[PDB]
Amino acid sequence: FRKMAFPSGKVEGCMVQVTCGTTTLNGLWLDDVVYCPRHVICNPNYEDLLIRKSNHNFLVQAGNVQLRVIGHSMQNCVLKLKVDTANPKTPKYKFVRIQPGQTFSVLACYNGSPSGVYQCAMRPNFTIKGGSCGSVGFNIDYDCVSFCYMHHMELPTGVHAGTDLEGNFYGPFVDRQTAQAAGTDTTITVNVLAWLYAAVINGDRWFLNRFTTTLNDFNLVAMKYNYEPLTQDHVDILGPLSAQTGIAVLDMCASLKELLQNGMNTILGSALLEDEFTPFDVVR
Amino acid sequence: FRKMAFPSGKVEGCMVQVTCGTTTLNGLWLDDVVYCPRHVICTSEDMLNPNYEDLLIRKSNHNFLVQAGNVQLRVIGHSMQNCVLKLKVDTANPKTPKYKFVRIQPGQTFSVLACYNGSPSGVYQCAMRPNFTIKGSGSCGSVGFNIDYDCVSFCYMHHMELPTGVHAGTDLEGNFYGPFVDRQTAQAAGTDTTITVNVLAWLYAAVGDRWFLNRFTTTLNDFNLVAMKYNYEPLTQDHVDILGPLSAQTGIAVLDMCASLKELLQNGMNGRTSALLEDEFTPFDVVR
Asked: Per residue in A169-198, is it b (16+ CB within 10 Å) or e — as a string?
């Protein structure tokens, strides 16, 4: 069972380079606006550093073409540079905010040049295990690109932190050089179950047993092994996989609890339990 | 350290749909030629004992329906080269990237753009397994590729699913990788082995981590005698030479890293970490 990223072509055509003084990073060019991390203009005072800036302080490059900046503005932690040319490659798109445990693709870029694409999950501690600042994360739904993430900073443990495209941070982080750390992370329980349903669909059934559990008894077992608590909405989202396979969610929870205590001695050719597929990803 | 796929845009603009009779799969549209698996001319029954010469001589250009998104492309010639069909169309693909065709060796990595009926669905990073199969994920005609300096090197086209769930296919000149054929025979992927040179390249990548090093070395022969007991591919002098650069930047001799690998296979990771020894990053990949 392979992790798959969305085809990145629609996003590739939007990546540009943004330079303010000696700082260069990636920007996202949609119609006649380029979006990028506001710290490109850098205990900072952003409203003051931006008032001191003029359009001529920004250099925007789309491949060979220099784009002329004709207005600048800030929205939370994202800088919005109005430019002289509308991106003729602008896809149908929306700005969305995702929740911990949801997945998306990141197009990693260096100085406006796309480098590679990978599938991510937003960890429960709101970080991502992933010159890349300004790279964006996204899902694609029938020609429409839903941008959900922009990369702002690396945390000392090596994970990544960023904002939605409206500039709102994911997690308790700020765009300053102060000391910050990811909280203790947790495993995304609903995604592990979705992945177990994927195993059954792929004909791997050895971890199934005759037992069922209670939502409360599993959650006491899940909290002990550092798993996110499972909710009734989690049971409802797993519904379609419980109908296709005939294994009820609390039946699958029984299986997971037994795996968390005895090991696999094996499941989709994996050793650990994979938690970066959502219920939606598995159906797809 | 993520397994990253190449940005897929340059290949997305080349994917089309090819239909012959009731069979539809993916094709690759480069200049005025569409490449697809020749078994597009087979009707499942034919797959048991297909005679491609006889099946193809009976087709005319208008039997092949080629669609590039909305536009139907007019086929004006056709030709078979080994196991790929080459359909000459009336229009050269305006989105053709700089490209070339290359045949790869087991252990080499590449990205696959998985497609259904001509429309890209997802992209993933791959290695050609030593048994010449792909542990990948209607997808016939999807292609594998590397991109170096805006040039797309096409190295794989998907043709067959094997009974164990893995995939077999050809280069873009239609020559199968491994002993597989585009016929529904009892054919199966032989026991697969770990790509040793890639594991070692990854260990060099690990080295600000060095908990797994030890004070031992090994001969090449002793390493291979041990590693083959874990179903690891034999390590050659070519492989030793390939890892030379990574051996320098880290200061760890290749056979010293081999000794570390021997101990990791003996011990495991003792709850530390991936909890797996990873073999789908090449020495070239690691440096990049």
From this structure: bbbebebeeeeeebeebbbbbbbbbbbbbb
Please tell me the CATH superfamily of domain B196-287, with its number.
Answer: main proteinase (3clpro) structure, domain 3 (1.10.1840.10)
- The distance from CA A34 to its chain's CA centroid, rounded to whole angstroms, is 20
> What is the crossing angle of helices B254-267 and B220-227, to 10°?
30
Give CA separation, B272 vs B59, B232, B237, B242, B262, in Å: 59, 22, 31, 28, 17
Q: Which residues of A touch B275 (CB under 8 A)?
A: 271-272
Identify which of B155, B185, B180, B154 has the alpha carbon closest to the alpha carbon of residue B167: B180
The residues with which B146 forms a beta bridge, in sequence order, are B153
Report domain A10-83's class: mainly beta
Whole-angstrom distance, CA of residue B120 vs CA of residue A56: 40
- Is residue A133 among the annotated active site residues? yes
Q: A72 and A58 in contact (C-beta within 8 Å)? A: yes
* Total Cβ atoms within 10 A of residue A266: 13
Q: What is the DSSP string of A177-215?
A: SS---PPPP-B-HHHHHHHHHHHHHTT--TT--S----H
Kindly tell me the sign of the dihedral angle through the C-alpha atoms of B149, A154, A278, B206.
positive
Please give the Cα distance from B224 to B203 (Å, whole number): 17
- Tell me which method was used to determine the 3D structure: X-ray
- Side chain identity, residue A182: A
Chain A residues lying within 8 Å of B122, measured CB to CB: 4-7
Nearest residue to A126 via CA among A174, A168, A162: A162
B39–chain A nearest CA distance, Å: 26
List chain B residues with CB under 8 Å of A272: 275
Q: What are the structure tokens assigned to A160, written together? A: 């990544």
CA distance B222 to chain A (A): 28
DSSP β-bridge partners for residue A120: A104
Q: At A205, phi and psi to the nearest 5? A: -125, 10
d(CA B127, CA B199): 12
- A160 as an active site residue: the answer is no
User: Which candidate in A8, A143, A202, A280 is best for mutational testing of the B interface (most B CBs within 10 A)?
Assistant: A8
- Kind and range of the H or E run holding A164: none
SS3 A102: coil
Nearest alpha-carbon partner for A191 in A242, A261, A121, A247: A121
- Decide if B4 and A107 are in contact by the 8 Å CB cutoff: no
What CATH number has the domain spanning A189-283? Answer: 1.10.1840.10
- How many Cβ pairs closer than 8 A exist between chain A and B? 69
